Design a binder for this molecule. Sequence first.
Ligand code: HEB
Ligand code: HEB
Ligand code: NA
Ligand code: NA
Ligand code: NA
Ligand code: NA
Ligand code: NA
Ligand code: NA
Lengths: 710, 710
Amino acid sequence: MHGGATTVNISTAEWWPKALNLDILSQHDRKTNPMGPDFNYQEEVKKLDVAALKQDLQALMTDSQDWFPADWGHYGGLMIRLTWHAAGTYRIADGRGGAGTGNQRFAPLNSWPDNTNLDKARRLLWPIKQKYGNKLSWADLIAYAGTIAYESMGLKTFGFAFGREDIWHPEKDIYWGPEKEWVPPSTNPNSRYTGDRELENPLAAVTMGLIYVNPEGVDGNPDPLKTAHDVRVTFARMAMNDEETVALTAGGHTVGKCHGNGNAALLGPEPEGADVEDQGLGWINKTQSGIGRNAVTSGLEGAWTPHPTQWDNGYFRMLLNYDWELKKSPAGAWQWEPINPREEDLPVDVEDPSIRRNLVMTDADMAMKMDPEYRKISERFYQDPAYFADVFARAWFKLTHRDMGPKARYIGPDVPQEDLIWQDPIPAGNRNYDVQAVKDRIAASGLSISELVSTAWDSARTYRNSDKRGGANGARIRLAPQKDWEGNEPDRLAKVLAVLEGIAAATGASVADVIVLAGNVGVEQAARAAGVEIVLPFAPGRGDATAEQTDTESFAVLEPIHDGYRNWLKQDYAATPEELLLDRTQLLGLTAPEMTVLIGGLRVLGTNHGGTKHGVFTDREGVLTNDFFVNLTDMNYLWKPAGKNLYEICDRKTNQVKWTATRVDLVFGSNSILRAYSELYAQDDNKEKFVRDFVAAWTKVMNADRFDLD
Amino acid sequence: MHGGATTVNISTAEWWPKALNLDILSQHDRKTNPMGPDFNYQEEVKKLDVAALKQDLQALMTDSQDWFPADWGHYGGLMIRLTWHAAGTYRIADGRGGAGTGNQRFAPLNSWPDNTNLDKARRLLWPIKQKYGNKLSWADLIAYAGTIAYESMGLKTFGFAFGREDIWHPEKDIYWGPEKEWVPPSTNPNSRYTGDRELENPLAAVTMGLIYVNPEGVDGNPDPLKTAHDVRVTFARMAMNDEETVALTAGGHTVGKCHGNGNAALLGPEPEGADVEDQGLGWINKTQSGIGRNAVTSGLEGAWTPHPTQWDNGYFRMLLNYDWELKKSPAGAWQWEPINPREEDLPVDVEDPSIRRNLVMTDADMAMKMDPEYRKISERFYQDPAYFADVFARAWFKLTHRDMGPKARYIGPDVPQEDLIWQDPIPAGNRNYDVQAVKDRIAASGLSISELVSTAWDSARTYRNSDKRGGANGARIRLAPQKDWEGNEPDRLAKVLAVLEGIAAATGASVADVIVLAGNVGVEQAARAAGVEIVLPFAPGRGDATAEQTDTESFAVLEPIHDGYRNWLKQDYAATPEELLLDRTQLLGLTAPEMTVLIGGLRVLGTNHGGTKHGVFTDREGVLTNDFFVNLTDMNYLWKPAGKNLYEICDRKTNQVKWTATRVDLVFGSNSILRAYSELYAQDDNKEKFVRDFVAAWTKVMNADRFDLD
Ligand code: HEB
Ligand code: HEB
Ligand code: NA
Ligand code: NA
Ligand code: NA
Ligand code: NA
Ligand code: NA
Ligand code: NA
C-alpha cells in the first residue's frame, strides 16, 4: 500500500481524453535508450560477419527445439510468417507500421491475435541475436529471417539490406484504429468502415488486430469475391498492386501451413497479458498439448501445398486444378478443402511423415481463383513460374524494405544495384562550388525573405520519419505532382524556381542545394534585421531527381493538405488543426520545444500560405523576433472565436481587433505544456535563445533526409 | 483524416491496463526540456536580484488587473491560497506532491476543483516571471508569492529559500487516488476509505480533487466534530501536528475570503477542458459576471475577518466570541454565519467599501472551536497572539519547504540559519584523508563482498527524489530507528558497523564515507574476481548526523518494508512486487535500464535479504557477471509457479529444479520492454558494458543525496 502511479491506467488521460498527445514527440529519448550516446548502429552492422550469420540462420531453420518444435523439422514456414507479419503492418498514407523498427517485439503488435505464436518465432531467433550482439539489430534479424527461410527452401531471393535501428518501447505515435476490442465485426460501434463499406482512410487492415484481411471471409462469412475486394483495398494501402498481391499470396502459401488442431479456448492470454511464468511468451496451452500437430494458431488447419517445406509450383496446381468447398477446421474455422484429392497430394503430418493430413485454402486464396483479375494473373503464374518467382522475389523485397528510405541507408553485401523506383532515388550532387557565391547570388536576386523561406520549408516538409520518404533532397518540389500542389502555392513556387534554377545552372550546385541555401539566406537576413549575425550551418551534396525516377502516384500520399507551420488547411477535416499539426511534427521527427520555436519564427517571417495575417503578432514582419510569444502571452488581449479555425485578438481596453489567429496559433497559449514553452520564449532574457533555437530547428528539418552524409 | 495517435486516449494502456508503467522512469528527459544541456538553475538563481523581486512582487499585490480584479485592491488573500494549495499537495508517506516542482501549472493539478481560479493567480504572476526570466523558476515564484503576500499584509514571515527547478510536464508518477470522478462522496465505488472510515494509506486528501478536507463537512454534511477528525488525519499525513494545524488554519483565514456569489453551473470547463479561446484559463463565466463580487470559486461566500486585507487577531475574535449557525451561500453551499454580528465587524464589499457583506466560517473553522484539543490551542492563540504569529510563520515556512530537502539546496538571502529538524540536517564531513588507506583497511577486514554491498545499499536506498529525504549522507543507518529496521538486517548491520566505525575513528573519515567506500570495495573486489580492474569514482564529504537531529518518528515513512533490489518483502501487500519495485526505483531517480543492471548485479553479488538464493542465477556468487541475464533469458529452462512470489526454474530435459526466483526476478524476463534490456545484457558481446553500466548505476545511487557538492 503505496503512492506510485505504478500501472498504466493511472494517468491524466482519463480526465481529459481529448487532450493533445504531446508524448509522441518525446519517444525514444536518452533514458529509455540503454546504449551509450556514441553508439552508432550503422558503423557496427558494417563490421558484421554476414556470411557467418547466413550460415547460422539457415541451420536454425532445421534446428527444431522441443518447447515449440518445427513443422516437419523446418521452421521456414513460421519464419516467413514472422517477417511477412512484421512488414505487413506498413500503410502508405503516413508510412507508419513496417518492419523497419523491429516493433513486433513490444506491445501492442506482439499480442495482436494475427501474431499468435510469432512470439515463438522471435524467441527462436534469440540465440543468433545473442551471438552477433550489437552488430545485429532485432529489427534486421526479424526482417532477414524469412528471406533466409526462402533461400533455404529453394527461392532465389532478390536481396537484402541491413540498417534498421532497434527501438526500446512501442511506437506510441501509431494510431491502429478506433476499436476497443479485438477483431470485432465491422457492424459494431467504433467501426472503421463508413459509407458503402469504405475503409477509414489511414487504416490498412479490416479490423483491429489483423494484418490485412479476415481469412474466414468478410466478418467471418466466406465469400471469395467479397474477400477479393478487401485484399485489393488493403494491399493497395500497403503499396502493392494486383500483380504483386497475387504473387505475395501464392508465394507465401507455397510453403508452410495453417494450425488449428485443438480448442482455441484452451489457449492462455496473449503475451502482454500472460503471467511472468510464461517467459514473455503467450497463447500457451497448459490444459493440453499446444505444440507440434496440436498447435492452434489461426485455427484453420491444413497446408496449401503437398510439399510445404519447399518452393515448388504446388500452390496453383492445387488451387486451379482441384475444385474446393467449405468445411470446418477442428477448432471451428471456415476453410476450403479440395474435393477428391489424391493421396500423393496430401501434406503429411508435422511429427510423423507416415500420416497424411489435409489441404486447405483460405477465403483469400479462393479469391485468387474467383476474382476475375486475380484469376488471369494466377493463370499467368501457373503457366510461367519463372515469372512468378521473379515477380514474387521482387515484391518480397519491396515488402520488407518499403519503409527503409533512400538507398544511402542500405548496408550489406546483398543489396541490389538496381535503383527501384519505390526507393525514391536521388543522385549524389556536386559538393565543390563556392557556397558564399550562391548566397550572394540568392541575396542579389529580387526575392523576399518570405519567398525564400516558404519555398525551402515546402521542399523539406514532405519528410516523414515513418518510412523515410520526402524531404528537400532530390528537389522533387520542382517536379510533378509537387510543383502543382495547392499547398505549395505553384505561382510563387514557379516564380522562385525560375530564379533558383538559374543560380544552380551558373554555379553547378543542385537546385536542391540552392533551394535550401536560399531558405538559409532569408533566415540570415531576418536575423540580421533584428541585429543578430548568424551563419546557419549548411551541408552540400543534394541531388536533383529525374521525373523518370519519380513515381507520380506514390507521392500523392505526401501532399501537404494541411500544414500548421504555414497556417495551411486545404479543407475542413474531422481532426482539429492542432492534432494535424502534431501528426506532421511527429513525422518530421520534431520535439515539442522545436515545434514551438518554428511556429513562432515562421509566423513573424510572414510565411502563411495565402499571405494571410493569422498569427503574425508583430509590427515587423520579416524580422526574426520572439514577438509571436510576447504578444500571445499578454493578457492585455482577450481572444474571441470568429468562426471556423479563426479568432480575433482584441484589446481589452478599446475592445478593438488587433490581430487574427487560428487554432494552430492559439493552442500554443492554451495547452498548459505549450504555453509553458511559449512563456519561456517570451521572457525578457530569451531573445537570443529563441533565435539560436529556431535556427537549430530549421536546420534539423533541412537536414532530416540527408542519409547520404551520416 | 490521418494516422497519428494524436489524442491521449489512443494508447496501449486500454488493452493491458494492469501493465507496469515504465514511463514514470523516463520523465523529464532531454526532449521535453527546452533548456540547454548546460543550463544550471542553481547558479542562475544565485545571481537574481531578490531585493528587486520583493519590491515587484509586493507592488503586484495591489496592482489590480481588470480581467480578474483584486478583492479590495489586495491580491494577497488569493496569492496565499495559491501557495497554500501548491504546497498542500505534499504527503509524507512517499514525499510526493509539494510546491517543490511548480506542478500546479500543468495537469491534473491546474484543473482540480479545489484549485478553482488559481489559474488566475498564476497568470497574474506572469509579468514578474517574464521580467526575471531564467533566474526565477515558476516553482520558486509560485512558492514565494504567498510569503510576500504575508509580509505585505503585516506578518513577520520566518524566511524563504529559492532552488526549485521547474519541470515541463505533469509528474506522471504521482498516484492521486482510485476515483474516476471529481469530489465524489466516500460512499461510492472506487472509494479511498476502507474499514472504520480509515483513509487509503498513501493518500492525504478526503477525496479526488481536494487538497485536504471538505469545507462543507464530511461528504458535504456539516458536523464540525467529524470534520475535526478528517483535518487531524489529513494534516498529519502532510506532517503537521495539532498545534501547527490550528495555526495554519487560523493564519490562512485571518486574511482573504470565500467566493460564491453566483451560480456555479454557469462556470465553464476547468482549464484542461476549456477551449483555446480561454487563454489556458478556466472556470470562466461567459453568461454573467464571474469577477469581483460576482466571483464563484469554492461557492461559500463571506470573509472570516472584518479586515481581510490584514494580519490582525480577527479570526479568533470572530470564531470564539460570536455564536454561529448553518446557512446557505448564494451558490448553495453550507457555511456558518455568526448570530447578531455588529455592523462594524462586517467585511465590506470587494468593489465598493460603503457596502457591508457577511462573515463566514467553514466546517473546518468550526472544528477549531468544537474539537476539544483544537479548542485549547485556539484559546492559547487567542490569549497569546505573539505565540500564534510565531507558530504560524514557522509552519508556513515548513509548509512551503517541507519537500526541498537538505539545507545545501536552499539559496538566497532570507534563509533561516536555524537547522530545523525536519530539514534532516547533516554536518559537512572531513574531506582530507587518504582514500586508498580506507580502502586497504576495509579490504584488510574480514568482511565479505556481500556484507559490504548490502550495508552500503541499505544506507542509500532510503533516498527519495520526491522530497529529497534519505540517502547515505549522514549515516542515519547507524541510528534509531534505522539500525533496528528488519529490512536492514540489524545483526549483520551491527556486525559491519562495529568494523567500519573503527576504520572511520582511525582515519577521520565519516562513518558515512566509510560505508559507501566499503560498498565500492566489495564491488571492485567482485569485478576483480571476474578479471575486470575498475576504480569506482568516489566523493568524500558526508557527515554523520546526531540522534538529536534525527526525528525518529518522521523516519518511519522511509522504512524499507519492501525492496526488490534485495528481494525483500516484509509482508504480502496488495500491490504486486514488481509495482513495488517500480515505485522505489522511481523514487531513487533511476531509469529502467539502470533498474535492470542493478538487479542483475546485486543478484550475482549475493545480496538478498536473508541470504536467500532467489534470482541468483550463477555458479559464482560474489563475482560480477552478466549471468543473471544470461540464465534468465535461456529457453533450456521453463518456469513454474511455486506459491507466493516464488517460482522454480526447471530444466526442460531433466525436469529438475535448477534455481528459484521471485516475481521481482522474473518480471525482467516477462515484460517485453524489460526482457529487451535483459536480452541486450545477455549478449556475448556485453559483459564489459554490463559492468561499466552496473557501476555507473551503483554510483548514481551512492551520490543521489550529495547536494552539498553540486
Ligand atoms: C509473402 C508471404 C505471405 C502473404 C502475402 C500472406 C498473406 C495472407 N495470409 Fe498467410 N502465411 C504465410 C505467408 C503469407 N501469407 C506463411 C509462410 C504461413 C505459414 C505459417 C507456418 O507455416 O507456420 C502463412 C499462414 C497463414 C495462416 C495460418 C496461420 C496459422 O498458423 O494458423 C492464415 C489464416 C493466413 C492468411 C493470409 C491471408 C488472409 C493473407 C492475405 C492474402 N496465412
Ligand atoms: C495557511 C493558509 C491556509 C490553510 C491551512 C487553509 C486551510 C483550509 N482552507 Fe483556506 N484559504 C486561505 C488559506 C488557508 N486555508 C486563504 C488565504 C484563502 C483566501 C482566498 C482569497 O481570499 O481569494 C482561503 C480560502 C478558502 C476557501 C474559499 C475559497 C474561495 O475563494 O471560495 C475555502 C472553502 C477554504 C477551506 C479551507 C479548509 C477546509 C482548510 C483545512 C483547514 N479556504
Ligand atoms: Na513505418
Ligand atoms: Na510447396
Ligand atoms: Na505426398
Ligand atoms: Na514532493
Ligand atoms: Na484580518
Ligand atoms: Na468595519
